Amino acid sequence: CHLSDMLQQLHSVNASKPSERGLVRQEEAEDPACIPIFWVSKWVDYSDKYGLGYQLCDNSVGVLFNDSTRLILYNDGDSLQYIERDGTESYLTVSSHPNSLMKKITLLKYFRNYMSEHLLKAGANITPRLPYLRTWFRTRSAIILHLSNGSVQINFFQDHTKLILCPLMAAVTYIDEKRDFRTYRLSLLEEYGCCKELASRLRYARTMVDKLLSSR
Amino acid sequence: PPPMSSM
C-alpha cells in the first residue's frame, strides 16, 4: 500500500502553497516521462445490483462485484483474472472457464459492450507509457478510484476534470476542461507553482486519500 | 447521481 506515500507527497505539495506565492511556472513542472501506464477511461456504477464496471485505457475491462469479488478481462477479450473475497487470484480464460464463473463473465461482457458502445474514452488521444480496482467511492463532486498499482484517480462530475495520482512516480496527471492531458512531478509543482484550479484539486485529493486510508 | 462516466 503506497497510500501513505501519496498522502505525504500531497501534504508536501499543498504545504508549499503552490498557487499563493510568486510567479507560477507550471509548464516547468511537466514531465512526459511520468505519463501513467494505466488509468480508468470509462466506468459504470451498477452497484445497486451488480457492482462497478470499468474500462482501463488499454481496453481491458474489470468489475468489482457487490460480493467483494473481482473479474478482469484482458484486452485480448478472452484472458481472465479472478480475485476471490479472501484475496486468492486465479488466471484463466473465458474459452476454458469454470461453470461457476459463467454468470459473472456474462455480466462483465454486458459491462464491456456498454462501455465500448456508449461512453467517452478518458485520455483517448494519449498513448500510455494489469492493475485491478482495489476500491472506489463517490462524493457529490467526484468518483474516487483506487487501483492496485497504487494509483488514485479522481473524476470530477461538474466540470469533467480528472486527476491521476501515481505515488511511485510522485506524479499527477491533470485532464482539464478542454481535455488537455498533462503530467506533472509533484516535487516540481512545489518548485515552480501551479494554477489555483490544480492547487484546489490537489487539496481535494489529499482529503480523498485520507478517506481511503481511514477506510482500509 | 450519474450512474456512469461521460457519454
Numbering used by the authors:
A (entry chain A): 372 to 500, 508 to 594
B (entry chain E): 101 to 107
Cite, word for word, the article reporting this structure.
We examined the crystal-packing interactions formed by the polo-box domain (PBD) of polo-like kinase 1 (Plk1), a validated anti-cancer target, whose phosphorylation-dependent protein–protein interactions are crucial for successful progression of the cell through mitosis. We have observed an unreported binding site in a number of crystal structures of the PBD, which is formed by the rearrangement of surface residues involved in crystal packing. This site is located close to the phosphopeptide-binding groove, making it potentially accessible for phosphorylated proteins binding to the PBD. The new binding site consists of seven residues: Val415, Leu478, and Phe482 form the bottom of the pocket whilst Tyr417, Tyr421, Tyr481, and Tyr485 form the sides of the pocket.
Only 2 out of 631 proteins—TCERG1 (transcription elongation regulator 1) and PBIP1 (polo-box interacting protein 1)—met our search criterion. Interaction between TCERG1 and PBD has not been characterized in detail before. Interestingly both proteins contain the sequence FXP, resembling the sequence involved in one of the observed crystal contacts. Pro103TCERG1 in TCERG1 occupies the place of Leu75PBIP1 in PBIP1 and imposes a conformational restraint that prevents the FMP motif from turning into the hydrophobic pocket, which is occupied by polyethylene glycol used in the crystallization buffer.
